Amino acid sequence: SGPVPSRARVYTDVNTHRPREYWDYESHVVEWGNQDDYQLVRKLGRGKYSEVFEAINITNNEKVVVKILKPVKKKKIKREIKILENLRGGPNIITLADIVKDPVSRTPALVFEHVNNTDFKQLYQTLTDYDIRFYMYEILKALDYCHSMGIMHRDVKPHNVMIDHEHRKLRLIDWGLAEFYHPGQEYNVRVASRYFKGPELLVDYQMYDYSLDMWSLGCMLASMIFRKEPFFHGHDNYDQLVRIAKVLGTEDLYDYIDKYNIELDPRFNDILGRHSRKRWERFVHSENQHLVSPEALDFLDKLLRYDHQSRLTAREAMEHPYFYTVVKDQA
Ligand SMILES: CC(=O)c1[nH]c2ccc(F)cc2c1-c1cn(CC2CCN(CCNS(=O)(=O)c3ccc(-c4c(O)cccc4F)cc3)CC2)nn1
Ligand SMILES: [Cl-]
């Protein structure tokens, strides 16, 4: 036969219970403003699907970010917009403030609240163990919210987390890969960034769920606390899985494959090999020990599992002892 079906352990039917217009983004009609309200100041970054500019709203002098979309499928634009609107006001979700089209070229852009991330290379290399716990909690607040709202982010990774440390402000950004979760729907595995792709995506298991975001969360925590960017440094999609096999081991991988009756690409035959599951200690050394603790390693081990159904949910994660101290201060 073919694969064994899978359903998310939490928020399973959340979208079944909502009215249709909530998730049927194909039919959302969009209302465009004039980009001429917004004047671009400088460029902030590029990417596969967009360029991002700092801009000024000339009607109220407010500073904003304009995200000019490169040509995506028309329905992916509706999708991102509908997701952003559904999540607007949620904890640590970037707030969408406008939808405009260039008046001549007719290119669409989204307008967001500005997050000030400048002097971030300092931030990277100087977050305390406490700050990492803090910002992990902030990320998790964003993921529990969007998962509870029936939405898979699918592209969690440091570049899609914006932090303004001066104001301990974190926003989860770029929802253009996000999808609504529906039980039984088979999704596109060609999502996320290579180093953050979950095993489900690498073996072509299409019926995945919110747990994917938590595998990605796992790869950021590991690469933060070990100081190894990226943690799983694969050289293509196939070899990405080998690199995970070299840490998680092959026994658990092949048990996962068997559990879900996954057809494994015959390419993986020769390369996956035979690998023992490593202890997290072999990634510790004097330069990163200050960020590694028993709690951090228990927490991380519970995110990086082959079987998506067995990874910690966002909510379960926020309850881990790792965050005991963060939870206390918030109060
Ligand atoms: C791209 C895009 O659609 C976009 N759309 C927007 C909408 C509104 C807006 F205003 C801006 C944009 C942008 C947007 C994108 N950019 C450029 C990048 C430059 C690289 N940094 C990554 C470092 N992050 S960061 O907070 O230091 C960071 C991240 C994570 C951690 C971390 C970790 O990796 C692991 C554990 C704990 C952690 F905290 C640390 C720092 C992010 C911004 N600027 N604006
Ligand atoms: Cl964005």
Domain with CATH 3.30.200.20 in the chain: 24-113
CATH superfamily of 24-113: Phosphorylase Kinase; domain 1 (3.30.200.20)
Distance in Å, CA 43 to ligand 2 centroid: 14
User: How many CB atoms are closer than 10 A to CB 148?
Assistant: 16
Rounded Cα gap, residues 128 and 220, in angstroms:
15
- This structure was determined by X-ray
User: How many CB atoms are closer than 10 A to CB 157?
Assistant: 19
The secondary element (H helix, E strand) that includes residue 246 is: helix 237-248
Domain with CATH 1.10.510.10 in the chain: 120-329
CA distances from 124 to 104, 118, 119, 134, 186 (A): 40, 11, 9, 14, 36
List the residue whose alpha carbon is closest to atom 41 of ligand 1. 124
36 is catalytic: no
Rounded Cα gap, residues 153 and 143, in angstroms:
8
Ligand 1 atom index nearest CA of 136: 37
Rounded Cα gap, residues 139 and 136, in angstroms:
5
CA 252 to chain centre: 24
Amino acid (one-letter) located at 189? V
Tell which residue, 2, 17, 102, has the closest CA to residue 55.
102
Residue 229 is assigned to a ligand binding site: no
Calculate the dihedral angle through the C-alpha atoms of 21, 26, 28, 33, rounding to the nearest 10 degrees: 160
Rounded Cα gap, residues 241 and 98, in angstroms:
40
Tell which residue, 196, 184, 205, 185, has the closest CA to residue 265.
205
Looking at domain 120-329, its CATH class is mainly alpha
